[PDB]
Structures are given as structure tokens and as C-alpha cells.
RNA sequence: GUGAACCGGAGAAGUCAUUUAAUAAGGCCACUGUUAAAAAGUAUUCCCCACGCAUGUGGGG
């Protein structure tokens, strides 16, 4: 496998395959074409808001393989989600029962998991101009991305231990603002 | 000296969090900031159990803190006096050379407990000229037997040999 | 014959006394056989420095006052007081 | 020849200064024989007479074997030891507990 | 009890007076610790000491 992760649009990957599909191209030229198609394939709503930072290896790379611009400026500024009160972490003793009777009692496994409950405050910030510029001037795709992001962030939860806690709650207060300078109301808490 | 080699290799294997933990503890004792004590105990204790020899606790602590502040790739054949002489030779021979040589010669007068800042200025001069290597194993071995006269004699002689050529 | 070189774990006097003890031990293991016993007394103020701790009693006595050593030597040589 | 500390080198040619012996056949000494004035008679009115003395040499190893130094070292303070596996400490700790 | 024995190189002294290391600076850029679980359990409690046909009571760890 690759030593480092590569972020790229899916729709261009077939073109990548074509670079390997041609047996008339030398290895250096094919590598340069692969570098070009990897560096240029950034038109996707995914990267648009999350950006990218790709650093090809220098101790291993062959010479004559130049690289174009790979960094993508982000358009999302998600802050960490923090509770609005003093946290109260709790422990949870658990065992693993054995279905077959034995000479001794209990058996299985013994453990102490952890859990907590809180009321959180969340922050999202989308720079409209940077998002539009990142999508190469498309406005319909930017509006679709904004609407899908609002609907997703309004109605999704992280999938951490949902098979045993199932905290599928919904938010009960949302403030949507359109300003020129980003501001945070986390100082209320 | 295999214990010193294992100590230095374990120091290179460290991640960035405990490296920052050690970086924040420069100039400090061992009795405060418990994560530093726990990390140093985890680093140093397995050496004594398997290997009969082990570097001294003060020397090991000083080496760990200096490595945290002045991260250098460990390479055999890059002892501190040789690099210091190579730096000193490409200097003005009237004013800068006596000052830097005085800062170097201050080192061979103290004990282990007071060598931190006089070594840190030396590593700062090294980092100023963009070094990429340092013999931590040889420096640790020399610092262990710092009270033997031939050790200091060979230290000074190696510095003069590198300076002269 | 080997000059005394100081270490952080000892003094100049301590190392000299220790080297004297080592030489006395080596020569007691050598020439001075059981032909005649050798009687010696060792003195340091208030037992400041021991000459050969234990070491099969290299020194026959350990003294912590000058008057006691003078009296011991006098009592050996004639028993006079 | 008895050696001092292990690093110390040794002289390679050992001069011997010995009295000249006539043997009653070689009645006349060689020209290298030199006169020293240390043949005593008395001590309170000190009186000396000369004597013919010659000087030869010896080679170490061929003529005199280098002896080995006795068991000795420069005195160092005892750095003690360390051992827990030791059963005596393994029982001393039980007595303490 | 030795070209030896008996056998001080000693007395006097302040290295002093003067001084800013000053001027310029971003460590930046990318990231799900995720996956499985009853705190339940009667068939001999680990030990001292008073009586009994009880199919055990009392006190001590």
C-alpha cells in the first residue's frame, strides 16, 4: 500500500487507469501524467470545504517528475463541540456471561467502560466566496452543497458506540447568520 | 556500551508528545511534573534489568533533555569536539575564536549537575551552522567517565586535532 | 608512586589514606610473614578517616584522640603512664 | 626485574658496574678500567684507597626476566553492589513485611 | 653507625581607575479509536471453643 494517504476526486480515477492502460508511454512520462492528473483532480464538494495538503516523498522520487500546485484552500471552519456545563464522566461495570454451566461461577470477561451525558454547543462557518472559487465559479453546486451540509449537520450523529447507547437526539436550537467577519458565541458558557 | 546504544535508539523512537513533555522540563528537577518522571522511568529502567551496565541517571536525564531540545540524527563518527573544532577553524582568529573557545573550555571544569546550559550554548552554536548529526553514544560514554583524567585529555586532544589538521 | 587524582566521591586526604591502606595490606600479604607480628596504631581526629575498614583488622587499633594514642604507644613500649 | 604499574615501560639495557678481577694471569687491567676512590680503612679519620672498576651491560629478558607486579590498585571508594534476585534479601524482605 | 654525623632562605607589600549588544521576523498547511459483552452465583465458608442426637445453636477472627 501507499505510505501516505492521497485525497482526490473519484470521477477522474478512470483517467488514472488509462495512464496505466497505455503500453507506449515510458515510465517517467507516465509518472508525470499521473502526477498531473492527481494534482489537478480537486473539483469535488468534498475537498471544497476540507481542503487538501499533499507532500510527495523526496527521498524516493525519481528525478524529472515535477509537481504542480496541490494545496486547496479550505472553506469550512468547524470548531470543537464543548458542553455548556461541568462534565460528569461515569464508569460502567460490565461482565460477559457464559451460556454453558461450569465448575466455577461467573467466568467470561470483566471490564469497566465509560460514558457521559451533556448539552453541547456547535459551530460551523462556511466562507461563501472561498467555496465558490474552490468550485471553479459554479453557484448551483455551491448552493446544493450549502443546503446538503445544513441538512446533514442538522440531522446526523457520530457513530461511536451507538449499538449500545443509541443517542440519536436532534438539536433544538439553530442560529444561521450572514456576516462579513466570523464570530463565536461560545463565550456565553 | 550496548545499554547506551539501546538508550539512544529508544530516544530516537520517541513520538512528539513525550518529546514536548521533555522539552517543557528543561532546567528542571526530576521530582516535579510527574509525566516526565514516568516517561524517564519507562525509558531508563528496562536497561538495568537486561543489560548489566547502564548509563548514570543524571547523565541519562541530561542526555534526554538535550535530545528533546536539540533533536539530532545519531551518527557514528560525529563527536562534539570534532564538530566544534571544525566550526572554530572557520572563524575570525582575533576576536570570535577566543570567545567561542572560552565557551567551549568552560565545559571541562564542572560536574554533570551543572553542564546543561554550557552544553546548550554549544548545541545552539551547532544548530546555527545547520548540523544534522551528533554522536550521542560517544558523548554519553564520555560524560559517564567525566572524572577520569585521560577522558578529558582525549577530549581536548581530539578538539585540537580537529582544529589543526 | 601513582599520583593521587581526586574524584567527586572522596577527598584528597581520604584517597591518600586509602592508598596507604592498600599498600599496607599488600605488603602485609607479602614479605611480613608469621616470623614476627607487626603492631600498629591508627589515629584520626574523632575517627574521621578509617584506614582499611574491617579488612581483617589491618590496623590493630582505631583512635580518636591524640592523648589516647600517646598513652597506647607508651603502654606498649614500657607500660609507663 | 620487578615492575611498577602496568603502563610503566622498562629500561632496555641495564648497566652493571663491577670490580675488576685480575685472575693472576691478566695482571694488567684494560684501558677502559677506571679508578674509583672508595676502598675504606677507617671512619672517624676517614681513609680511602683507589680500586679498578669496569662497566658492562645486560639485556633485559635474555639476562633478567621481567617480574610481575603484586596485586594492587589505586584506592577507589567502594561503589557497593546491587542484587535482589539474591535469596537472602528475598527472605530479609519477608522478615520486614 | 656510609665523602658521614650535628644542619630553615628568612624578613615588606591593594592591579587599580572608564563603559547599553544594539537595530528586522507566522511554523505554517491534511485527519472518525473504531468494532463483542447479565454482577451474577445453594448443595461442603478459611479458622478458635461450651452442650448434643441433632439432622445445631451461641461467642471469637
Smallest CA–C1' separation from D40: which nucleotide?
E2
**Is the Cβ of D74 closer than 8 Å to some Cβ of chain C?**
yes
If 0-12 CB within 10 Å is exposed, 13-18 middle and 19+ buried, where does residue B61 land? buried
| Chain C residue numbers touching D70 (CB-CB < 8 A) | 26, 29-30
User: Contact, A65 vs A33, CB < 8 A?
Assistant: no
How many Å apart are CA B147 and CA C8, to the nearest integer? 8
How many Å apart are CA D37 and CA B68, to the nearest integer? 78
Separation of CA D85 and C1' E61 in angstroms? Answer: 35
User: Contact, C35 vs C63, CB < 8 A?
Assistant: no
How many Å apart are CA A47 and CA A73, to the nearest integer? 9
User: Contact, A34 vs A2, CB < 8 A?
Assistant: no
* Cβ contact B111–C5 (<8 Å): no
- In DSSP terms, A94 is beta-bridged to A111
The label of the residue with cell 677506571 reads D34
CA A128 to chain centre: 19
What percentage of chain C's residues is helix, strand, coil (to nearest 5)? Answer: 40, 5, 55
CA A50 to chain centre: 7
Resolution to 1 decimal, in Å?
3.4
Separation of CA A93 and C1' E41 in angstroms? Answer: 17
- In DSSP terms, D34 is beta-bridged to D53
How many Å apart are CA B32 and CA B21, to the nearest integer? 12
How many Å apart are CA A42 and CA A62, to the nearest integer? 24
How many Å apart are CA A98 and CA A104, to the nearest integer? 11
Separation of CA A115 and C1' E38 in angstroms? Answer: 19
Which of D4, D74, D77, D79 is most worth mutating to test chain C (most C CB atoms within 10 A of its CB)? D74
Which experiment gave this structure? cryo-EM
| Chain B residue numbers touching C5 (CB-CB < 8 A) | 149
Q: In chain E, which nucleotides are within 7 Å of a protein Cβ?
A: 1-4, 29-41
User: Contact, D29 vs D52, CB < 8 A?
Assistant: yes
Closest D-chain CA to C11: D77
For residue B139, give the H/E element and its range: helix B136-144
How open is the CA angle A143-A146-A152, to the nearest 5 degrees? 140
**Is the Cβ of B111 closer than 8 Å to some Cβ of chain C?**
yes
Q: What are phi and psi of A156, to 5 degrees?
A: -145, 155
**Is the Cβ of D28 closer than 8 Å to some Cβ of chain C?**
no
- What residues have CB less than 8 Å from C75, skipping those under 6 apart? C81
B133-134 and B73-74 as β-strands: parallel, antiparallel, unpaired? parallel
* Cβ contact C8–B149 (<8 Å): no
Q: How far is B18 from chain C (nearest CA, A)?
A: 33
Report residue A30 as a C-alpha cell: 507516465
Measuring alpha carbon to C1', the residue closest to nucleotide E3 is D46
Q: How far is B89 from chain C (nearest CA, A)?
A: 33
How open is the CA angle B66-B69-B71, to the nearest 5 degrees? 85
* Cβ contact B111–C8 (<8 Å): yes
* Cβ contact C19–D74 (<8 Å): yes
If 0-12 CB within 10 Å is exposed, 13-18 middle and 19+ buried, where does residue B86 land? middle
How many Å apart are CA C70 and CA C76, to the nearest integer? 10
| Chain B residue numbers touching C7 (CB-CB < 8 A) | 147
The label of the residue with cell 581520604 reads C14
Helices H / strands E in chain C, number of each: 2, 2
Separation of CA B160 and C1' E43 in angstroms? Answer: 89
Q: How far is C72 from chain D (nearest CA, A)?
A: 29
User: Contact, D1 vs D69, CB < 8 A?
Assistant: no
How many Å apart are CA C49 and CA C18, to the nearest integer? 9
How many Å apart are CA A86 and CA C34, to the nearest integer? 86
Q: What are phi and psi of A76, to 5 degrees?
A: -120, 145
Separation of CA D52 and C1' E25 in angstroms? Answer: 92
- What residues have CB less than 8 Å from C47, skipping those under 6 apart? C62, C64
Nearest to A6, CA basis, from A45, A79, A57: A57
How many Å apart are CA A133 and CA B74, to the nearest integer? 47
The label of the residue with cell 679508578 reads D35
Smallest CA–C1' separation from D37: which nucleotide?
E3
Contact map slice: C 10-69 vs D, CB within 8 A: 10, 14-15, 18-19, 21-23, 26, 29-30
Amino acid at each position: 500500500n501507499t505510505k501516505m494517504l492521497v485525497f482526490m476526486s473519484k470521477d477522474k480515477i478512470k483517467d488514472l487507469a488509462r495512464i496505466v492502460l497505455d503500453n507506449s508511454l515510458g515510465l517517467t512520462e507516465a509518472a508525470q501524467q499521473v502526477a498531473n492528473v492527481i494534482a489537478q483532480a480537486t473539483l469535488a464538494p468534498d475537498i471544497a470545504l476540507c481542503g487538501r495538503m499533499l507532500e510527495p516523498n523526496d527521498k524516493d522520487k525519481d528525478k524529472k517528475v515535477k509537481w504542480s500546485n496541490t494545496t486547496v484552500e479550505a472553506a469550512l471552519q468547524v470548531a470543537h463541540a464543548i458542553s455548556t456545563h461541568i462534565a460528569r464522566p461515569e464508569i460502567d461495570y460490565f461482565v460477559a456471561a457464559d451460556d454453558v454451566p461450569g465448575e466455577d461461577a461467573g467466568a467470561g470477561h470483566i471490564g469497566e467502560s465509560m460514558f457521559a451525558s451533556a448539552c453541547f454547543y456547535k459551530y460551523f462557518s462556511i466562507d461563501w466566496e472561498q467555496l465558490v472559487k474552490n468550485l471553479k465559479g459554479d453557484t448551483n453546486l455551491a448552493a446544493h452543497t450549502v443546503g446538503a451540509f445544513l441538512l446533514a449537520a442538522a440531522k446526523t450523529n457520530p457513530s461511536g458506540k451507538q449499538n449500545s447507547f443509541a443517542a440519536h437526539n436532534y438539536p433544538d436550537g439553530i442560529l444561521v447568520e450572514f456576516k462579513n467577519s466570523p464570530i463565536s458565541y461560545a463565550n456565553a458558557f | 556500551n550496548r545499554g547506551t546504544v539501546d538508550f539512544i535508539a529508544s530516544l530516537e523512537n520517541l513520538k512528539e508528545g513525550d518529546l514536548g513533555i521533555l522539552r517543557k522540563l528543561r532546567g528542571a528537577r526530576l521530582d516535579e511534573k510527574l509525566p516526565g518522571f514516568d516517561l524517564f522511568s519507562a525509558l531508563w529502567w528496562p536497561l538495568r534489568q537486561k543489560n548489566q551496565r547502564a548509563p548514570k541517571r543524571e547523565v541519562a536525564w541530561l542526555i534526554a533533555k538535550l535530545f528533546a531540545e536539540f533533536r539530532f540524527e545519531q551518527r557514528e563518527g560525529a563527536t562534539l569536539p570534532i564538530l566544534m573544532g571544525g566550526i572554530c577553524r572557520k572563524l575570525e582568529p582575533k576576536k570570535e575564536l577566543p570567545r567561542v573557545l572560552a565557551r567551549f573550555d568552560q565545559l571541562a571544569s564542572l560536574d554533570i549537575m551543572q553542564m546543561e546550559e554550557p552544553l546548550s550554548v554549544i548545541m545552539g552554536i551547532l544548530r546555527k551552522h545547520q548540523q544534522v548529526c551528533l554522536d550521542w553514544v560517544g558523548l554519553t560514554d564520555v560524560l559517564s567517565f567525566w572524572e577520569q583524567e585521560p577522558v578529558k585529555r582525549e577530549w581536548s586532544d581530539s578538539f585540537i586535532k580537529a582544529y589543526k589538521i | 608512586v601513582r599520583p593521587v587524582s581526586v574524584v567527586k566521591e572522596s577527598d584528597l586526604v581520604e584517597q591518600s589514606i586509602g592508598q596507604l591502606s592498600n599498600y599496607v595490606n599488600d605488603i602485609r600479604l607479602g614479605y611480613y610473614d608469621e616470623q614476627s607480628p607487626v603492631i600498629g596504631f591508627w589515629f584520626s581526629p574523632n575517627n574521621r578517616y578509617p584506614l582499611g575498614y574491617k579488612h581483617s583488622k589491618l590496623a590493630s587499633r582505631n583512635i580518636g584522640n591524640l592523648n589516647e594514642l600517646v598513652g597506647a604507644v607508651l603502654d606498649y613500649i614500657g607500660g609507663f603512664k | 626485574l620487578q615492575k611498577r604499574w602496568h603502563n610503566e615501560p622498562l629500561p632496555q639495557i641495564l648497566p652493571c658496574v663491577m670490580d675488576w678481577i685480575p685472575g693472576y694471569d691478566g695482571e694488567h687491567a684494560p684501558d677502559d678500567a677506571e679508578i674509583h676512590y672508595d676502598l675504606p680503612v677507617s671512619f672517624q679519620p676517614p681513609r680511602h684507597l683507589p680500586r679498578f672498576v669496569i662497566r658492562r651491560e645486560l639485556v633485559v629478558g635474555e639476562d633478567v626476566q621481567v617480574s610481575r607486579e603484586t596485586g594492587t590498585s589505586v584506592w577507589r571508594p567502594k561503589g557497593t553492589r546491587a542484587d535482589y534476585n539474591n535469596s537472602e534479601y528475598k527472605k530479609v524482605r519477608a522478615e520486614r513485611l
